[PDB]
Amino acid sequence: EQSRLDLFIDRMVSQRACLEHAIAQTAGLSGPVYELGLGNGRTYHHLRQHVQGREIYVFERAVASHPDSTPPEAQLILGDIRETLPATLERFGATASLVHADLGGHNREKNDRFARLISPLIEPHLAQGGLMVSSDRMYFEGLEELPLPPGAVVGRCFIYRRG
Amino acid sequence: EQSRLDLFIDRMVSQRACLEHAIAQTAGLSGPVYELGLGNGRTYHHLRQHVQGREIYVFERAVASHPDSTPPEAQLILGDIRETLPATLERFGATASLVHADLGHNREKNDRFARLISPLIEPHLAQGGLMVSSDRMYFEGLEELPLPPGAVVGRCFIYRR
Ligand SMILES: C[S@@+](CC[C@H](N)C(=O)[O-])C[C@H]1O[C@@H](n2cnc3c(N)ncnc32)[C@H](O)[C@@H]1O
Ligand code: NI
Ligand code: NI
């Protein structure tokens, strides 16, 4: 049995491990990193520190980030990702190197329904060799699930790749 | 070079390690556990899974936690702690086994607040009672204990009556 504190710690530790791994594994790609969900902005802040030589675009419906974790307007894609993902695909095509999602709220069942719904909206964005890291199990057609790196906790984050 | 994600992992890992150790060290005491600040209720949810044979009272200004991490009405002490700690002292006396606080990252404000609440908290502790905090505290007669394995020095603190 795990508390909500144990789960939150395991989530953050897994994000850090999975994102650092995913950045390294995609360092030969030059397309952007997509951050789905800004929130307080901790993973965005982490990405800004660890991503070199790629842009980071942030998808968010309402910006309320800690001030030092706020994306510049040019890299903010504002609105509901159910509309903005398809709009962005027309703009940038299948060029993303890394897509990170931490879109979940407090209700795990709602989170899983949303993961199901958004999976086919995310999949077309990835370049060949691109990775997708999520704090929800995803429902992709073509992306292969990868084994987790050291430090990650099974069931907290999931990693997928466009082969 | 630590990011905000690195810092918050260290905060939460240290809080958990300190709290679990503190709960165990005070498991022989029958007086209640006081949680100062509910917030989203993750820490309260943790306390519920680990504290045995004692009540948990939560001090909060206004409840904003999901139902799954909200204490029962009877264990919620609502209002500004400058008032509610002294009011609680008249009600329950120096019987608390464990008092826990996370402050929330600005050095000077936190420190002034730690100085403000230290003398409010101190009289509540029963003999053998512990106080666990995210920030350095300023007690008259409580001794600082070593950190347990897993806690990051400077990110959490433990004191004892
Ligand atoms: C858990 S918070 C993100 C926390 C972040 N990863 C961090 O480390 O601080 C989830 C965020 O996703 C956003 N979000 C959820 N559904 C969305 C949607 N359909 N479109 C755009 N943003 C959404 C929320 O508004 C919220 O800011
Ligand atoms: Ni299908
Ligand atoms: Ni399918």
Automatic annotation (TrEMBL), chain B:
Keywords: S-adenosyl-L-methionine. The keyword S-adenosyl-L-methionine applies. S-adenosyl-L-methionine binds at residues 39, 41-43, 60-61, 80-81. The keyword S-adenosyl-L-methionine applies. It comes from the Bacteria. This is S-adenosyl-L-methionine methyltransferase. It comes from Ruegeria pomeroyi (strain ATCC 700808 / DSM 15171 / DSS-3). The lineage of its organism: Bacteria, Pseudomonadati, Pseudomonadota, Alphaproteobacteria, Rhodobacterales.
